[PDB]
Amino acid sequence: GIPIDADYVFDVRFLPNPHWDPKLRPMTGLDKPVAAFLDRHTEVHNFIYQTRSYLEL
Amino acid sequence: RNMPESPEIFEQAMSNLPDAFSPQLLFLDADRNTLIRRYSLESAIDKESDLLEPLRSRADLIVDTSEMSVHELAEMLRTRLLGKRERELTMVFESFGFKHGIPIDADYVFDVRFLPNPHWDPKLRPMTGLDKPVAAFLDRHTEVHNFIYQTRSYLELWLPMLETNNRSYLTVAIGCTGGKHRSVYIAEQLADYFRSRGKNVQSRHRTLEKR
Amino acid sequence: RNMPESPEIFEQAMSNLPDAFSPQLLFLDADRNTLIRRYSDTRRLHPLSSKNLSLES
Amino acid sequence: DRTELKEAKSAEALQWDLSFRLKHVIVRAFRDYLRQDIGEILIDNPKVLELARQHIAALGRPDFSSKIKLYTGEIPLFSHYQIESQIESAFQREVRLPSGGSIVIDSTEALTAIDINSARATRGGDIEETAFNTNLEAADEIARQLRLRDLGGLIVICFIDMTPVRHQRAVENRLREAVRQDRARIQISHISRFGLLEMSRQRLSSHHVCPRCSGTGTVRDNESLSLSILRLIEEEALKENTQEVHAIVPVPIASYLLNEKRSAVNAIETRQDGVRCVIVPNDQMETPHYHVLRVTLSYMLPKLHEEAM
Amino acid sequence: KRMLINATQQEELRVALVDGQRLYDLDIESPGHEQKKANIYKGKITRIEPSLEAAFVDYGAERHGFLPLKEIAREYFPANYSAHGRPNIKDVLREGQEVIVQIDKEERGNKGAALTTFISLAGSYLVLMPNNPRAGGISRRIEGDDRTELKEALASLELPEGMGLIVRTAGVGKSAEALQWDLSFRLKHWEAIKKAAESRPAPFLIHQESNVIVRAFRDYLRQDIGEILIDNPKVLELARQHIAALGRPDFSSKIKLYTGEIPLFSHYQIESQIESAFQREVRLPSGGSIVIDSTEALTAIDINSARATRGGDIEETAFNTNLEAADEIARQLRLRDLGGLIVICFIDMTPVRHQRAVENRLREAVRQDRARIQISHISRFGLLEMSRQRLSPSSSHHVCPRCSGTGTVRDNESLSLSILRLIEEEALKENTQEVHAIVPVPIASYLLNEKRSAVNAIETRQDGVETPHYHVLRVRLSYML
Amino acid sequence: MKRMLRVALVDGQRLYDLDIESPGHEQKKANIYKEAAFVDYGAERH
RNA sequence: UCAUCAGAUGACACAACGUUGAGUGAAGCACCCACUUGUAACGCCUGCUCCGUUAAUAAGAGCAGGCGUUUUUU
């Protein structure tokens, strides 16, 4: 459930699920391998950046 | 105005066009008077229709737009060209009040506390977001228009991917403190845009619907 | 929309104008705030949405 | 054109017909369809066709009746192929829709009522547009079934709620358009702030109450009846000059009456000192239906009372 | 006014507010209302669930209910509890323990019904959390100085340690002492609730809600009432439940326990009206009729009246029947408890001001009604609309077996012909070599005899092949089939 | 197109109107046959 | 029972009318209209508001009647 302290909420589901790789599924969010998988996918960059443009604004 | 005297030339050049760009022809029809509502007045059209008749013969699709509407046309078009996906969204725009709490179900939410508050004018305090006084009052203050735009842009950019994977709902909930003045107006207008683009939409003014 | 990146394009195009028909231009204008307030007519994006920060920019 | 004939098929042609009426039903169905934009009129019974030939001379229009001809094949006409859908529709209290929505042509004693039920698809999408779309389909079917079932008067409708007022207005306009082709006395109105729609009449020109409940849609519950009739009986019991009490009721009633509530019955005998009480379960009587008579064997009086009522 | 209570048979609870000798308000209890919500109960855990982190508990026969782990109180937890995320219900309590609990969620799904350890108390002014201390504060509607000064008044009042309180939304808060009174009364009731529950370990209903008292006094009763009547004195003390526990004993005078040798309702001769409350059409009180029917999409009423065929009467007398009716409409309205879409067929009249007059008579009755009502002007056709929201948000044999809600009989001859044509349409279908079917006997009785050679033709065409309840199955002894 | 087929009126494809025969008909006095307080018009209620 | 997809609570505030017409709804409350013209009768009454009065009762006014009897018409 949504954290009660949330002021904004941005779903992120549709981004490429790292789950596909069974190897990465046990690995946590902070573990570099997943950071690599995410880095591999540019769409991630597009989202981060566009979201950085949305807030800063 | 673009209709040639000799359409043989029309189809000849229509042949000339390069292959990659596939041509398609749509023709339209409605009641004679139905057209007058959007608009001599019988014979102009009759002779012109003779001019246009070759096209209707050549029409790939013909529609009867007598009872048509923008949404009708937009959906008709979306399926007409983009093809139909049984996968389909139904965006739900909810206006909630941060007092009462964030909706139990919500994919995206946007705080609209910073935008000009109709609350400042006391004659407005009772009236709610769907009373044209406040609708106007915002419409003036540009920042409102600025936000309505930028947000509509953000969603629009991330809307296609979400279409993939057969999502059955996507809910965006827009929140003021009380959820009567700002969030309502934004939810409404912001909905209408997406309605124009033809995606299915459904509004819900959660605070007003309390009573 | 129909604005080329190269300047000289419409220049030479104006040059090719035949019949010495008077090429009389017209031009409209208004302020940034007025424009924005007017550009929100349920219209599409300023085609300059190529990572262009904001309608204003 | 009327003006010239006023002094005067011509009036000469009119004169022949005037003799019969002045000198003086199924053919009246032909009078219902004077438009005669119909070419094919096929009869499976040739005797009826010959009666139609006798009625072609009375109709006095051989040129219009040139295409009339008895035909073996109802299916090509769709008389035996397509028409049947509507054929039973005219008695379907509810009508499905091509859109999937539906209607409920009610028969309230005070006035005619119809609500329209949206196509209850698996999920909900754009329910507002869905409402208008389904609404438009409905409106179309409305006038058809309205004429076809041959019922009009104080008609009212309850649409799926429609927020956009202008779009609601467009719907109303569709209604105006609905019956332009119809020839009957019609007078539409506007939406209700509630959302209802006052409607027009059809009084221009096969059933009865149901056997159980005497035409009341519902039936009161047995447990409710266990106390109702009891009160009735005790009420009549105090009636003076009363010697005994007769009661008629169907079996499941008297069952839970006596065996299940024997105590009150006996207490009712003690309070009502001296007036006899008889209760008679009868198989023929319906669940609400029964009788009673305070003024024969305890298992053989109902024959007598039945010969009474 | 006069109040009528009959409980000769506990099954049906008939209670009414009659002005003079005529009944006005209706609250005949419908057994099976089963408003189990907020009913204190006993029982024993049926199925501790590690996977669902919840415990079924058998309050009653239908299901074994539901218990979220978080809802549990200190009494259920052992004296030696441990904090490791505390997800372990087996560690909390072994099943079978006796329980204290109130109805929480009206079972409305195949899933269990929901119940909570933290019980609640429904007080006119106040609400007590007997166990959970956390809950507190004031409801929304009351605010301002009321919110400020009431927070001073409740702070002045002293509650047992570990007990929270929620002031009802009816926060007049005028008498801090009244708060004290009703609170304490609830406190003694809560103390009386757990003690009595300590009677035995079996599952049983400790407390519940019943229009008999919860709705009879908080909603139905008013200060204007002059007479209070009770039939079953067994519940006379159950009436003293509130005689002063409401904090206003002034009705002690009102109590007038029925003792006559006549059933109380007839003693005021009300059953005529009462039956009218169900009798489909009501004879107009002055004379005429007010006929009611529900479309189940709407509800409509008609007023064919004056009870005559040919005589001397006028439109202002028909207009007179429309005014007198309006009231009885309101009466029947509140009585049979309608809510939704209501429309009339007033007999129309030339005097327009008469139209205004009659609607005025209607609106005056609407103002004194507890419910909320929307009204509309008459129609050009005359059909006047009206919508009153149901005051009571509560398949009652909705369709008779023969009627099916329609209450309309397809004619036997029509029934036959429909069947015959359906048979023929079935015969021509591909892969048909027989047409077996079920048909009401009386239809068949007059069916074949008139249609011997007709059926002969039916057979020749495709060679080789109650009233609602007819079902024909096509084939690709009659008495046993 | 319009076709007439129990009596059936088919307008083009869909059925524009219907007509069935039942015992009796909607006929005014002496349609197909032949201030007093009470009179014999076939009844006396009117 | 790890994942994935679908399925009745602090410290606040609330003026001026010059928010006036920048923009007048939402719900209440009031008044205010329209234009085609097409059964009796009595018996006794175990009782219910009230109203009078003195005498709270009680007597008595009005009489949804439950129904007895009598003609009798709906």
Short mmCIF file of C-alpha atoms in Angstrom, two decimals, chain B residues 28 42-57:
data_model
loop_
_atom_site.label_atom_id
_atom_site.label_comp_id
_atom_site.label_asym_id
_atom_site.label_seq_id
_atom_site.Cartn_x
_atom_site.Cartn_y
_atom_site.Cartn_z
CA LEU B 28 -18.22 10.86 -45.37
CA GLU B 42 -29.15 22.29 -51.63
CA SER B 43 -27.96 22.63 -55.21
CA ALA B 44 -24.41 23.71 -54.46
CA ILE B 45 -24.11 20.42 -52.59
CA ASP B 46 -25.98 18.39 -55.21
CA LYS B 47 -23.78 19.34 -58.16
CA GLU B 48 -20.70 19.16 -55.96
CA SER B 49 -21.76 15.66 -54.94
CA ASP B 50 -21.72 14.66 -58.56
CA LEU B 51 -18.16 15.95 -58.61
CA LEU B 52 -17.32 13.91 -55.51
CA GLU B 53 -19.14 10.75 -56.59
CA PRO B 54 -16.06 9.18 -58.25
CA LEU B 55 -14.35 9.30 -54.88
CA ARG B 56 -17.15 7.59 -52.98
CA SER B 57 -16.91 4.95 -55.68
#
